[PDB]
Each structure stands twice: as C-alpha cells, then as structure tokens.
Amino acid sequence: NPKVLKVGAIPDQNQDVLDKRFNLFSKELSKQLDVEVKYIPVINYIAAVTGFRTKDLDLVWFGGLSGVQARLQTPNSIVIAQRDIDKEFKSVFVVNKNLELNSISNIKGLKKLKNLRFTFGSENSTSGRLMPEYFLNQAGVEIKHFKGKKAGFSGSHDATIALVNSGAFDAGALNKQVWENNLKNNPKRTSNLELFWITPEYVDYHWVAQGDLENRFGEGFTKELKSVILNLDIKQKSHKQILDMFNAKRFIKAESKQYKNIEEIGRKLNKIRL
Numbered sequence: 001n002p003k004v005l006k007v008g009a010i011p012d013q014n015q016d017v018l019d020k021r022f023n024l025f026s027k028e029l030s031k032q033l034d035v036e037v038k039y040i041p042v043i044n045y046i047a048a049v050t051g052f053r054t055k056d057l058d059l060v061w062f063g064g065l066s067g068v069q070a071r072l073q074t075p076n077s078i079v080i081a082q083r084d085i086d087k088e089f090k091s092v093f094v095v096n097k098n099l100e101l102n103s104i105s106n107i108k109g110l111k112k113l114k115n116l117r118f119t120f121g122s123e124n125s126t127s128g129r130l131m132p133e134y135f136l137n138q139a140g141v142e143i144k145h146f147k148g149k150k151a152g153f154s155g156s157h158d159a160t161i162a163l164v165n166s167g168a169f170d171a172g173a174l175n176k177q178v179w180e181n182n183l184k185n186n187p188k189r190t191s192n193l194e195l196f197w198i199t200p201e202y203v204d205y206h207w208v209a210q211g212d213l214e215n216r217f218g219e220g221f222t223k224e225l226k227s228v229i230l231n232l233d234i235k236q237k238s239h240k241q242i243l244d245m246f247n248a249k250r251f252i253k254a255e256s257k258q259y260k261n262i263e264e265i266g267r268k269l270n271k272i273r274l
C-alpha cells in the first residue's frame with residue numbers, strides 16, 4: 001500500500017516496549033503529516049534490513065551496522081535523524097554474580113572472560129555484537145576462547161540480560177541505555193547481574209527513510225518528515241511521552257558520513273553481509 005507510511009525498527013528490545021514506542025511515534029507523525037502511518041513489526045534485524053530493501057518499510061529506526069547494511073542494499077535512501085547519545089554511544093559488558101568476578105577499568109581486563117559462556121545480542125547488533133567483538137579482539141579475546149569455542153547471539157538487548165540473569169550464560173554485552181532502563185524500571189530482571197565494563201564511544205542508532213517518498217506523498221514530504229522528527233519538543237506532553245521512550249530530550253540531524261567507522265569495522269569483521 002503506497003499511501004500508508006510504514007514505520008519499522010530493529011527488534012532490539014522486547015516487543016511490548018517496541019509496540020508502545022513505535023505506535024505512539026506513528027500516531028504523532030500521522031497527526032503532523034496528515035497521512036496514514038503504521039508501525040509494522042519484524043522478526044529479527046535481518047528482516048528490518050530486507051523489509052526496507054523490498055519497500056515493505058518506509059521509515060526505520062536502525063542501529064549503526066544495520067543502517068549501513070540497509071543503505072548499501074538500498075541506494076539513495078536518506079539518513080534522517082539520531083539522538084544526541086547516538087553520536088557517543090556505549091556498550092556494557094555484564095556478568096552473572098555467581099562468578100564473583102570483579103569489574104574492570106581497562107580494556108585488557110576483558111581477558112577475564114575467556115573460558116566463560118558468553119552471549120552477544122543480535123549477530124547484526126552494533127552495541128550488542130560488532131563493537132563488543134571489536135573491543136574483545138583488541139584485548140586478545142576471540143570467540144574461539146569462550147566455553148564451547150562459540151558465542152551465543154541472543155537477538156536483542158533484553159534477551160541478553162535475561163540469558164545472563166538466568167545463568168544460561170555467564171557474561172554478555174549490550175546497549176548501555178537498555179541496561180540502565182532495566183536496572184531502574186525492571187530490577188527483577190537484573191537481580192543476578194553486575195556491571196563488568198563500560199566501552200569506549202562509537203556511533204549507533206538512526207532513522208533512515210526511503211528516497212522515493214515524494215512520488216507517493218508529494219513534493220517536500222521528506223523535508224516535512226525530517227522537520228517533524230527534529231522538532232519533537234520535550235515541553236509538549238505527547239512529544240515527551242515519545243521522547244522518554246527513546247531516552248532522549250530531542251532528535252538531532254545525522255549524516256551518512258558519520259557511519260564510516262562502523263562500516264570499516266563491519267568490513268574487517270566480515271559483517272557487512274547480513
């Protein structure tokens with residue numbers, strides 16, 4: 001249906017959170033743009049990229065890696081916006097309390113994760129896989145050093161927390177904002193977990209739009225869409241509700257140039273391929 005603006009997102013958290021966030025976002029866009037807007041869930045990160053490529057999705061909340069992948073597969077698409085935090089984004093490594101492992105204050109301490117059961121997030125996660133693996137490798141830790149000579153891939157930051165919290169895995173890595181959200185608002189999910197390490201900064205999440213929206217929605221639509229997202233205003237109750245779900249005071253401009261380092265890291269780890 002070409003007259004519906006279809007919103008998507010990488011499934012980086014439990015579906016209940018995603019539904020609430022993206023349905024509220026969609027309703028606000030629909031009011032301001034005077035068009036039908038619908039959030040369309042997907043099963044995994046690959047499905048977000050491929051749904052964008054096939055034009056089943058028009059406007060998608062991507063991670064750094066998955067947004068790079070999507071824009072490579074889908075030429076002439078548009079980087080729309082990000083949060084302030086997405087310019088200086090971080091991961092956390094977490095460990096199960098039962099290990100009695102002390103936190104570290106230097107990257108070389110990641111060697112303490114060798115011979116443990118370790119899970120990443122999605123195979124295509126920036127904060128849950130790509131950057132954690134990069135940092136592990138800098139410490140001399142490779143996937144083959146983990147218990148079983150393999151790592152888990154949980155598919156989402158909430159799922160990583162749940163796996164380490166249950167003792168299915170000893171350790172994992174995830175989005176630092178998600179870790180903090182769970183720690184405060186869902187403390188039972190984090191009862192058996194301790195913060196192990198906070199990573200250096202890198203670029204992450206961003207909105208990506210199709211390049212052809214004008215043909216369906218009229219001249220100037222993409223500009224209007226970008227404007228609506230950038231002008232979301234913490235002082236307005238309905239905007240606040242949306243913005244709080246993104247753990248942000250505002251959205252800001254983002255350009256394709258800024259994802260060069262993620263792309264290069266992706267190439268080095270053979271992760272540009274889905």
Ligand SMILES: O=[P-]([O-])[O-]
Nearest residue numbers: 063064125126127
């Ligand atoms: O790509 P995102 O899960 O940090």
